[PDB]
Amino acid sequence: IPEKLEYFINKYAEHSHDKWSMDKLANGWIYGEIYSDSSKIQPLMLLSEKEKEIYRWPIKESLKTMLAWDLHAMAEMMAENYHNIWAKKKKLELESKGGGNHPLLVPYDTLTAKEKAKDREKAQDIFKFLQISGYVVSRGXXXXXXXXXXXXXXXXXXXXXXXXXXX
């Protein structure tokens, strides 16, 4: 991973702090040493240091997938990556601790439309952040051609018919 993409990661972490601070001041949250949710005190002014640093990994994982692997297609692809890793984690841990079946034990096509927006929100956020910098990524006539192919096939068929008539 290049240090330019490291700069981009630091800029993303900055702007996520920035948008979370917009939310924090819109809801009027204040800082405090004690952790609580009803008394309106937070040690990073509900989210903890660990709660924020756990968001560090999935961005790098998505970058690895994107570099190893139109805009809406890539958005759906990133959403599918997130949903697939979530399904993998919950499936392995279900098989581990003997948990009950979840309603999300189905492929991504049979799913409904709300979890779509679930996985598309943060995808669209990350994709906006990618497209502000300038960094362009991708996946990595026809009728005439079809007519020509049909003509070739017809010619071959005519040749075969001539051969059969000769036979």
What is the Cα–Cα distance from 137 to 71, expressed in whole angstroms?
9
Question: Integer distance in angstroms from the first to the last C-alpha of the chain?
Answer: 68
